[PDB]
């Protein structure tokens, strides 16, 4: 009964420190399995990129926020800005699914911390480098990139993702992960057929030339009798006597149902092979650390910093 000893986590683990420093505290929870899913999330300051990871990896929609693996925003929202997720965290669900809730790319809280206290000329051109370093590390290492967005069609996000691909260090065919566009805090409008078609058209025209698998295996789980009207793509929206006890017309699927149907997709996401080998959960950490050193001291960023 001892030949099958499992291992689980309780809270997140930060690979990249607050000052962008790699950590070796995740190997303790790693194993020698081959098929290891690695889903990362990128988004704005208050785009809600950790609550999604928490509800997808271990937690559920019906559970206290303090119990979430990744700390959410409870009292920091009302206070000065946000950015409670300093660095890239780490968590491997019982299903061996690695989760990476990075910091908010292009966040004002990080800029304020930098201004109040680094090898650059201005802190504003530095918060954009950390964002690029995290976007390139989330593309060369992760199998899925959950691009969370508080509000829909942030042209800055679509123009930044296309800039993170340019920094993606290839030659370890170029490995390009998927792209799940989560519309966190979605209103009743986002769940309309016309709104769905408009969103698909907009995200297909903005990401028309990305080379990233942003379309194909999403947005067709919980809807009406609707056949595929638009060129469907990866887009999963997440909302925010007896007659008298009728709940109001939410207009969107239940939060629990959407969380479940998104977790099922994330777990079922295609897990293509890594750069050049299987890179088991143990080899992966030895493959994501080298990528971190190669991107933090890469020529792509060294040249992009001068253009800023």
């Amino acid at each position: 009964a001892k030949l099958l000893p499992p291992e689980r986590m309780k809270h997140s683990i930060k690979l990249v420190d607050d000052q962008m420093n790699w950590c070796d505290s995740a190997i303790e929870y790693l194993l020698d399995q081959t098929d290891v899913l690695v889903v990362g999330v990128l988004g704005l300051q208050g785009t809600g990129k950790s609550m999604v990871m928490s509800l997808l990896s271990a937690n559920t929609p019906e559970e206290d926020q303090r119990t979430y693996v990744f700390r959410a925003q409870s009292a920091e929202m009302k206070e000065r800005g946000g950015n409670q997720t300093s660095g890239i965290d780490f968590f491997i669900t019982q299903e061996r699914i690695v989760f990476l809730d990075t910091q908010p790319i292009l966040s004002p809280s990080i800029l304020d911390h930098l201004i109040n206290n680094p090898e650059y000329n201005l802190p504003h051109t530095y918060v954009e480098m950390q964002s690029l370093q995290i976007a390139a590390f989330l593309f060369t290492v992760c199998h899925v990139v959950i691009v969370v967005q508080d509000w829909f069609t942030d042209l800055s996000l679509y123009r930044f993702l296309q800039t993170a691909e340019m920094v993606k260090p290839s030659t370890p065919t170029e490995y390009y992960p998927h792209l799940v566009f989560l519309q966190n805090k979605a209103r009743r409008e986002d769940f309309c057929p016309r709104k769905l078609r408009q969103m698909h058209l907009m995200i297909d025209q903005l990401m028309a030339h990305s080379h990233l698998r942003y379309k194909g295996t999403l947005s067709m789980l919980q809807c009406n009798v609707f056949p595929g009207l638009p060129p469907d793509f990866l887009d999963s929206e997440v909302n925010l006597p007896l007659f008298s006890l009728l709940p109001g017309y939410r207009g969107h699927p239940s939060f629990q149902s959407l969380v479940s149907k998104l977790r099922s997709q994330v777990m079922s996401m295609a897990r293509p092979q890594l750069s050049h080998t299987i890179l088991t959960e143990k080899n992966w950490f030895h493959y994501a650390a080298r990528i971190w050193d190669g991107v933090r001291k890469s020529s792509a960023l060294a040249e992009y910093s001068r253009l800023l």
Binding site: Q45, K78, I115, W151, S156, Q198, L240
Partner: protein
């Protein structure tokens, strides 16, 4: 009787002077029935000016009961014109390079239309329904000083024969426009503190990025007053469905005080002397009139919408970094 149009508004030859005070309205908005800028225009003047139901279609509207000329910009950053852009780019206008150049041209037209607000305006109201200061605007505001300076003589040489006055022709604008950012709420006394936090964050950002200098810079500080409003969490058709549930059974300014606290400094000629650093205190109120303002804006639009201005777009080098990197 006022028509929400800018191109037709400037092409005029009633309310002549009016001691108007123009207010620019730009920023990003989400896909909704009523745009954020339209809702702001409707709530400010206390009337539904824009009744609900790939260019920068800048439209103006004058309020006789308030003497305010709201100029709202439809920059590509907005998701209303971006939808039409992606629709026209889907069926018939493009390769990767051509699409990138199209997006770059759209962003350049947006920056041009925005410089038309930082050049002829008094107050400015941003729109970002996230409650988080978009750092990108920094690189945009740092990309407008270049155009506001290099394209400065190109604008002075086109507004000389205008009754705007001496200071307006000197600095090319009626007065330093005050930025009053306006963010919408999504999840949340609690808002009173968030406003001050965002104000401090924006101040620190613009001070560390040189976006808010101690002189006649493109923007202003607004230290005494407040320049960070937070909208309450209505817009779509859900009030009727929420009224069915009821029919079957049977401090903290709001879009007027937060904006009037700054509009009075221009309507009363108080000015925008909110400067720090023991400077010379250059504060030219320059309270314009509808006739003079239209006379100036006609030339400003004819020059920017551009003989040499069209050749200054390459002088930015702050938003097309992707092209140079590639």
């Amino acid at each position: 009787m006022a028509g929400p149009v800018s191109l037709r508004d400037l092409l005029m030859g009633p309310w002549r002077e009016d001691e108007i005070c123009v207010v620019g309205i730009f920023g990003k908005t989400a896909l909704r029935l009523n745009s954020e800028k339209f809702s702001l225009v409707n709530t400010v003047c206390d009337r539904q000016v824009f009744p609900l139901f790939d260019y920068s279609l800048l439209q103006a509207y004058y309020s006789q009961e308030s003497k305010v000329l709201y100029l709202l910009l439809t920059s590509i950053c907005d998701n209303s014109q971006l939808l039409r852009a992606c629709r026209a780019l889907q069926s018939g206008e493009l390769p990767h390079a051509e699409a990138h150049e199209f997006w770059k041209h759209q962003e350049k037209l947006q920056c041009l239309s925005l410089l038309y607000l930082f050049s002829v305006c008094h107050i400015l109201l941003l729109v970002h329904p996230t409650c988080s200061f978009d750092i990108t605007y920094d690189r945009v505001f740092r990309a407008l000083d270049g155009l506001r300076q290099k394209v400065l003589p190109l604008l002075k040489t086109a507004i000389k024969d205008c009754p705007v006055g001496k200071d307006w022709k000197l600095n090319c604008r009626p007065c330093p426009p005050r930025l009053l950012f306006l963010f919408q709420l999504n999840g949340a006394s609690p808002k009173r503190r968030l406003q001050h936090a965002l104000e401090d964050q924006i101040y620190r950002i613009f001070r560390k990025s040189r976006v808010l200098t101690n002189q006649s810079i493109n923007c202003l500080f607004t230290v005494p007053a407040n320049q960070a409003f937070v909208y309450i969490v209505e817009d779509p058709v859900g009030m009727l469905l929420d009224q069915l549930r009821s029919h079957c059974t049977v401090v903290d300014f709001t879009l007027r005080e937060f904006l009037w606290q700054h509009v009075e400094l221009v309507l009363s000629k108080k000015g925008f002397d909110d400067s720090v650093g023991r400077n010379p205190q250059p504060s030219h109120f320059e309270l314009p009139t509808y006739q003079k303002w239209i006379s100036a804006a006609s030339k400003l639009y004819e020059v920017a919408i551009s003989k040499i201005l069209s050749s200054i777009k390459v002088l930015e080098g702050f938003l097309d970094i992707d092209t140079k990197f590639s």
